[PDB]
Amino acid sequence: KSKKILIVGAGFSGAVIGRQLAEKGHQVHIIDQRDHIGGNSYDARDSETNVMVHVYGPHIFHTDNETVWNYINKHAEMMPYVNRVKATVNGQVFSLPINLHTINQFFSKTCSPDEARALIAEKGDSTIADPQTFEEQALRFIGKELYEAFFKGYTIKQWGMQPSELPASILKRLPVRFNYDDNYFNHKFQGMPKCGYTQMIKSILNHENIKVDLQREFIVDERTHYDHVFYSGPLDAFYGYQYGRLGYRTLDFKKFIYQGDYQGCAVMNYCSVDVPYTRITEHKYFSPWEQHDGSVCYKEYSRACEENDIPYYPIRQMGEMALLEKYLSLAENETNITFVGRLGTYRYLDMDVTIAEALKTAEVYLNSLTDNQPMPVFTVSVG
Amino acid sequence: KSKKILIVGAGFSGAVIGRQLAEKGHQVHIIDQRDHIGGNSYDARDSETNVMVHVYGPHIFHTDNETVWNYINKHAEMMPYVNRVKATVNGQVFSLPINLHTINQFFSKTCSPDEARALIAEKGDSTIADPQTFEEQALRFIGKELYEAFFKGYTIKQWGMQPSELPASILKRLPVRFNYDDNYFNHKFQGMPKCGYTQMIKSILNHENIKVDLQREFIVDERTHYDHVFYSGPLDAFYGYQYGRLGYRTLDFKKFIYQGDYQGCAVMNYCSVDVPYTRITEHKYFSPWEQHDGSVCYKEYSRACEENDIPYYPIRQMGEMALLEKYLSLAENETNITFVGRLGTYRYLDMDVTIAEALKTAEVYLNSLTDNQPMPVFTVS
Ligand SMILES: Cc1cc2nc3c(=O)[nH]c(=O)nc-3n(C[C@H](O)[C@H](O)[C@H](O)COP(=O)(O)OP(=O)(O)OC[C@H]3O[C@@H](n4cnc5c(N)ncnc54)[C@H](O)[C@@H]3O)c2cc1C
Ligand SMILES: Cc1cc2nc3c(=O)[nH]c(=O)nc-3n(C[C@H](O)[C@H](O)[C@H](O)COP(=O)(O)OP(=O)(O)OC[C@H]3O[C@@H](n4cnc5c(N)ncnc54)[C@H](O)[C@@H]3O)c2cc1C
Ligand SMILES: Cc1cc2nc3c(=O)[nH]c(=O)nc-3n(C[C@H](O)[C@H](O)[C@H](O)COP(=O)(O)O)c2cc1C
Ligand SMILES: Cc1cc2nc3c(=O)[nH]c(=O)nc-3n(C[C@H](O)[C@H](O)[C@H](O)COP(=O)(O)O)c2cc1C
Ligand SMILES: Cc1cc2nc3c(=O)[nH]c(=O)nc-3n(C[C@H](O)[C@H](O)[C@H](O)COP(=O)(O)O)c2cc1C
Ligand SMILES: Cc1cc2nc3c(=O)[nH]c(=O)nc-3n(C[C@H](O)[C@H](O)[C@H](O)COP(=O)(O)O)c2cc1C
């Protein structure tokens, strides 16, 4: 039997869940409160320059998950693109993430890989048994100089907290590289959709069993008209923020246009705390197969997400997780709804991860129909 | 009607011409004086370390020709790979080709693309009206500091001549990229074959109608036993060097083994004339999908190609070109032979260009049979 399915959000989570269910006979209704599909992966062209802008931040696809990679290759033409980030600090321009070139330039050396290991082991404090803070992780592995140049001010700008108050886990993600590889991501598959993500999501959304209504906020009354609801909007919002708002950072993107090449690369970080934006992005460099004389650029600023700002990065410290636990115990009591995605589960999720989880969620739901088991509220852990 | 083809050389020129024709019926005899196939593209695994070594120096595949790309993808699995070269001079490590990073690092600046254009325009030596040498052209374009750090020394080593001895026309464009792009090659397709060029050519060569004999020299007396000869060996040698030897640079490779990552990139250039090698190459870096604890490296030394050396880079200056012209006008009176390849034609040819010209050559020969026309001696200009 064909089921009636409400899906709240037309970003990757809604779109991929909808597509998998559509293809199996169910009637899928996808709503989104914005006037366009795509969620935070949405891109659109700038009128004047015709530059394709990644509206809610640069979005670089990267994955080791070949199943996911083949899936999106069914919906776009993936162009090779290797993200290579630069940084300006101390009157110089460096390569990130920290590599043998960054090391040799910063200390004015011509170390080989093994000489650079010895120079960095010497700067690091191997007396720290198990770093508990971001700061201690930097002192342990990269040393004071590298830390204060590349990480301290930059991290303070992103998080609005001292690094001695942030977990080690943030920097554990980012080892020093003792060769000349300056690819930002190590994933086996990396690229950018030739006609953009909006178009990719449009192809995912393109089926006979899917109706998509925009400018349409979810209404708690609707649930009864459907067999199941998939919700990728904010968890706290669905509960009227009755216990408080989940803490996020937000970003302000300050637009400017330049005639020519403003910086010569897609991403420039500004490591100094005394430079108020975290970075400048030059969006035409995200589509190097195209040529554009005019250029759309953004200065990006980080700050605490207030009531009417878009939530970007979830903060997820003790207070935030105590608040989450309260919404979760409301959530565990529900029937015929599943909360999914970055907003629905209060997790930062890359595009490929979001896709893989959306495929699994559809599969769980389909399996639950044929086994006549109830569909759980979450198909992922958040304890 | 089935032709007896002799093809001199089992590198890309002969392999590709040979397969195109073997597939339309002709009997193809390929010979090569060396003891392995592949010509200068040949690779092989080093015994101690198992690193795939590029025996005649690094070979990176790159093209904008998608027909050529699809063609090698039939005979190999192409892995992605983007060449990015580092260079050590004056106690610093830089990015090449010269780019906005090289410039900011070199001068200690944080220039944007356009401020950097303004910076190089001032450094450019503007008192030099009408430059005649490579030296003067470089000086006018980018000034003394950049010229002497990155060009003067490396030119001396690479060409065995001072840039004052070479023509201004050798570099027609200001050589700075005013962006952060440090991909050495700008081609749409770039990659490395997962199992090596030798296996790729071994696959091009695998046909019933193709016999390959190695350790086998061409001998003029052979010509009479075949209907056509495709010749990829050196044009001057084919005619006994009767007018002189075409000028080339040759390269010496000095092998060492390091346990670890010796330098942390495939290719490190040394710009200084006081360092006698041109580059150090670390070959495992040409196969990043592979992991190796032991690493095979080479210091590369460039010198004049003398009579017993392998010819690498064609010098192609005034005298060499006049000299080439003489063998060309002898070749123009040959019949039943076509000269092809970097050696048969005295050109530096990429792998992709060489494959495209081979496919076209076989086709021109196929067409000439069906149309009853004579095959030309050269299939390019
Ligand atoms: C700054 C930033 C940079 C990023 N960069 C990368 C990157 O480089 N690479 C990468 O792989 N990933 C990146 N990501 C992750 C990426 O954006 C997510 O993977 C993806 O957006 C998740 O999609 P989703 O559909 O689950 O959620 P979303 O895209 O957020 O979409 C959810 C949808 O729900 C709608 N909605 C919410 N509430 C309601 C409501 N009550 N009623 C109706 N509609 C509602 C919203 O309007 C929205 O359109 C980045 C994320 C951020 C914040
Ligand atoms: C230092 C160097 C670096 C290079 N790097 C790149 C690179 O990164 N990427 C790229 O695309 N290309 C590169 N190339 C170009 C590449 O090597 C050529 O494209 C390729 O070798 C062309 O193959 P071919 O068959 O025409 O000629 P060759 O490979 O030179 O083959 C000619 C064959 O003919 C044989 N032969 C000659 N005379 C006789 C005779 N008397 N009797 C019998 N056999 C004979 C030879 O033994 C040889 O095996 C490089 C070239 C050089 C010199
Ligand atoms: C509060 C916060 C939480 C973040 N959580 C993640 C995360 O879980 N995974 C991730 O890849 N990036 C996360 N990021 C961002 C990265 O650490 C990264 O450095 C940042 O997005 C800017 O640089 P990037 O886009 O190159 O990664 C977070 C950023 C902030 C401010
Ligand atoms: C340091 C350096 C020196 C080079 N010297 C030469 C040279 O002497 N002759 C030459 O033809 N190319 C030389 N090149 C290669 C040139 O950059 C050239 O632009 C390009 O590689 C030409 O080939 P393409 O057909 O792939 O574009 C040199 C490159 C570098 C970085
Ligand atoms: C004939 C020739 C000689 C060159 N010699 C040098 C050199 O000595 N040092 C150097 O850094 N670059 C040298 N170059 C490299 C120029 O930067 C090269 O054209 C540059 O890579 C062009 O880059 P592009 O790919 O942006 O066109 C040479 C290039 C050519 C064609
Ligand atoms: C005399 C001479 C001619 C060369 N001609 C070419 C050429 O036509 N195309 C090319 O890509 N490289 C050519 N090169 C090699 C280039 O200089 C460049 O360095 C190549 O990208 C790396 O070769 P190399 O660094 O050993 O010189 C030539 C080198 C020399 C010495």
Active-site entry in A34, A117, A223, A249: A249
* Residue B184 to residue B188: CA distance in whole angstroms: 12
Spatial contact of A326 and A278, defined as CB atoms under 8 Å apart: no
Nearest to A172 by CA among A130, A123, A137: A137
Å between A356 CA and nearest CA of chain B: 24
Return contacts of B368-375, CB within 8 angstroms, 24+ apart.
B369/B1, B369/B3, B374/B335, B375/B228, B375/B336, B375/B338
B117 at interface of A, judged by CB pairs closer than 8 A: no
Q: Please name the amino acid found at residue B256.
A: F
- Helix, strand, coil tally for chain B in percent (to 5): 35, 20, 45
Q: How close A268 comes to chain B (CA, Å)?
A: 10
DSSP, residue by residue, B323-360: HHHHHHHHHTT--SEEE-HHHHHT----HHHHHHHHHH
Angstrom CA distances, A249 to A314, A318, B26, B245, stand at 6, 16, 71, 71
Task: Indicate the DSSP class of residue B102.
Answer: H
Binding residue positions of A for UDP-alpha-D-galactose: 83, 150, 155, 159, 184, 269, 279, 313, 348
Q: What is the DSSP letter of B151?
A: I
Nearest-CB residue to B88 (from A84, A92, A110): A110
Structure-block tokens of residue B361: 């050559």
Beta carbons within 10 angstroms of residue A308's beta carbon: 6
| Residues of B involved in catalysis | 173, 177, 249, 279, 300, 348, 350
Of the CA atoms within 13 Å of residue A78, those in its CB half-sphere come to 18
The whole-angstrom separation of Cα A177 and Cα B65 is 35
The contacts of residue B289 (CB under 8 Å, 6+ apart) are B79, B194
Question: Which of A78, A115, A179, A180 is most worth mutating to test chain B (most B CB atoms within 10 A of its CB)?
Answer: A180
Comparing CB atoms, the residue among A100, A114, A264 nearest residue B180 is A264
Resolution (Å) of this entry: 2.3
A284 neighbourhood in chain B, CB within 8 Å: none
Give the closest residue (by CA) to ligand 1 atom 15: A350
For chain B, the C-alpha Rg in angstroms (whole number) is 23
Please tell me whether the peptide bond between B167 and the residue prior to it is cis, using omega within 30 degrees of 0.
Answer: no
Separation in Å, CA of B42 to nearest CA in chain A: 26
Note if A213 is an active site residue: no
Q: Cβ distance B23 to B245 under 8 Å?
A: no
Does B162 contact A at CB distance below 8 Å? Answer: no
Cis ω for the linkage preceding B58 (within 30 of 0) = no
CATH 3.40.50.720, applies to B1-82+185-247+317-372: yes
The DSSP-derived string for A277-313 is: SSEEEEGGGG-TTS--SEEEEEEEEEEEPPTTSPP-E
The set of residues, in sequence order, having a beta carbon less than 8 Å from that of B206 and lying 6+ positions away, is none
Helix, strand or coil, per DSSP, at residue A253: strand
Q: Do B264 and A180 touch (CB under 8 A)?
A: yes
CA dihedral B151, B156, B160, B165 (to 10 degrees): 70
Chain breaks in chain B (C to N over 2.5 A) after: none
Here the contacts of A24-28 (C-beta below 8 Å, separation 24 or greater) are: A24/A366, A25/A209, A26/A2, A26/A209, A27/A2, A27/A3, A27/A209, A28/A209, A28/A210, A28/A211
A365, A374 contact by CB (below 8 A):
no
Rounded Cα gap, residues B354 and A378, in angstroms: 58
The CA dihedral of B366, B370, B376, B379, to the nearest 10 degrees, is -40
Alpha carbon distances (Å) from A247 to A157, A164, A316, A323, A346? 16, 19, 7, 9, 9
User: What contacts B260, CB < 8 A, 6 or more positions away?
Assistant: A113, A114, B293, B295
Domain locations along chain B: 1-82+185-247+317-372, 83-184+248-316
